[PDB]
Scaffold this motif. Structure first.
Motif, PDB file in Angstrom:
ATOM      1  N   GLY A  75      -4.779  -9.743  -9.403  1.00 56.43           N
ATOM      2  CA  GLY A  75      -4.158 -10.875  -8.821  1.00 56.43           C
ATOM      3  C   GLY A  75      -3.033 -10.152  -7.902  1.00 56.43           C
ATOM      4  O   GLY A  75      -2.500 -11.085  -7.077  1.00 56.43           O
ATOM      5  N   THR A  76      -2.581  -8.905  -7.834  1.00 53.99           N
ATOM      6  CA  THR A  76      -1.545  -8.682  -6.960  1.00 53.99           C
ATOM      7  C   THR A  76      -2.164  -7.384  -5.768  1.00 53.99           C
ATOM      8  O   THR A  76      -2.897  -6.616  -6.432  1.00 53.99           O
ATOM      9  N   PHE A  77      -1.855  -7.726  -4.839  1.00 51.27           N
ATOM     10  CA  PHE A  77      -2.112  -6.723  -3.703  1.00 51.27           C
ATOM     11  C   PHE A  77      -0.894  -5.438  -3.457  1.00 51.27           C
ATOM     12  O   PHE A  77       0.283  -5.970  -3.180  1.00 51.27           O
ATOM     13  N   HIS A  78      -1.210  -4.272  -3.736  1.00 53.50           N
ATOM     14  CA  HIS A  78      -0.294  -3.255  -3.587  1.00 53.50           C
ATOM     15  C   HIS A  78      -0.277  -2.361  -2.240  1.00 53.50           C
ATOM     16  O   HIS A  78      -1.371  -1.887  -1.981  1.00 53.50           O
ATOM     17  N   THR A  79       0.917  -2.100  -1.581  1.00 52.41           N
ATOM     18  CA  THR A  79       0.872  -1.159  -0.295  1.00 52.41           C
ATOM     19  C   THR A  79       1.972  -0.557  -0.047  1.00 52.41           C
ATOM     20  O   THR A  79       3.035  -0.695  -1.017  1.00 52.41           O
ATOM     21  N   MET A  80       2.419  -0.052   0.882  1.00 53.64           N
ATOM     22  CA  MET A  80       3.564   0.584   1.379  1.00 53.64           C
ATOM     23  C   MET A  80       4.067  -0.333   2.088  1.00 53.64           C
ATOM     24  O   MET A  80       4.025  -1.012   3.302  1.00 53.64           O
ATOM     25  N   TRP A  81       5.694  -0.110   1.882  1.00 54.21           N
ATOM     26  CA  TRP A  81       6.824  -0.864   2.533  1.00 54.21           C
ATOM     27  C   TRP A  81       6.518  -0.573   4.240  1.00 54.21           C
ATOM     28  O   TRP A  81       6.804  -1.375   5.121  1.00 54.21           O
ATOM     29  N   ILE A  96      -1.653 -14.234   1.767  1.00 57.24           N
ATOM     30  CA  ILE A  96      -1.143 -13.705   0.641  1.00 57.24           C
ATOM     31  C   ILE A  96       0.376 -13.159   1.251  1.00 57.24           C
ATOM     32  O   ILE A  96       0.488 -12.615   2.554  1.00 57.24           O
ATOM     33  N   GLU A  97       1.476 -13.519   0.148  1.00 58.40           N
ATOM     34  CA  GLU A  97       2.901 -13.391   0.653  1.00 58.40           C
ATOM     35  C   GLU A  97       3.470 -12.373  -0.207  1.00 58.40           C
ATOM     36  O   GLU A  97       2.957 -12.174  -1.446  1.00 58.40           O
ATOM     37  N   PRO A  98       4.385 -11.594   0.367  1.00 61.29           N
ATOM     38  CA  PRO A  98       5.193 -10.512  -0.369  1.00 61.29           C
ATOM     39  C   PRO A  98       5.662 -11.151  -1.732  1.00 61.29           C
ATOM     40  O   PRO A  98       6.397 -12.384  -1.553  1.00 61.29           O
TER      41      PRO A  98
END
Length: 202
Positions: A75-81, A96-98
């Protein structure tokens, strides 16, 4: 202010997150992207978000540009700042929000805290499941190097893909995500390497 988004950043699913047996045998292998897809066209885009590796594409007047990649898990999207700097993302009309970020690790998550649970210890090999601009997904097996930091230790791989691959998953032999490609850090010896989250000890 405006009630519109300042940028149209769209997610596009590209691959399942898995260890690829062909890449363990040969060092690299192409992965299935789907009708089977023979060529990636960067400028086009392709309860409805599921697990996998995605491209992040930003709309302009000339079409989409791939600015990075990430991983959906639990349920969580992970990426680079550095790729999104906290901008809202879209997937097939869903926003989708941070939810969480760590600028020092160059990480940001959307829709929950960090879920990636890959692990690495010295001497093991990992696979970069690289989503490069313009290319179908490819798994490339590699052996991280170990590094001392100014608060403990971290593993890194070499920066051997396009910068627009930033956020692609680096998987251990269990299929779990040790970290994401493209957290560039400087070594005392002059080199830039790609640091692996989860490997950090501090």
């Amino acid at each position: 202010g405006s009630h519109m988004l300042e940028a149209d950043l769209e997610l596009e699913r590209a691959a399942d997150v898995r260890w690829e047996e062909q890449a363990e045998i040969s060092g690299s292998s192409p992965i299935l992207s789907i009708s089977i897809k023979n060529e990636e066209e960067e400028q086009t885009l392709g309860a409805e978000l599921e697990d996998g590796a995605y491209r992040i594409k930003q709309k302009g007047i000339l079409g989409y540009s791939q600015i990075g990649a990430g991983v959906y898990k639990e349920g969580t999207f992970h990426t680079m700042w550095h790729v999104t700097r906290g901008a809202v993302l879209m997937h097939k009309g869903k926003r989708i929000e941070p939810s969480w970020a760590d600028v020092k690790k160059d990480l940001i998550s959307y829709g929950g805290g960090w879920k990636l649970e890959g692990e690495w210890k010295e001497g093991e090999e990992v696979q970069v499941l690289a989503l490069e601009p313009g290319k179908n997904p490819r798994a490339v097996q590699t052996k991280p190097g170990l590094f001392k930091t100014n608060t403990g230790t971290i593993g890194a791989v070499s920066l051997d893909f396009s910068p627009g691959t930033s956020g692609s998953p680096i998987v251990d032999k269990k299929g779990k995500v040790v970290g994401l490609y493209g957290n560039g850090v400087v070594t005392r010896s002059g080199a830039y390497v790609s640091a692996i989250a989860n490997t950090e000890k501090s």
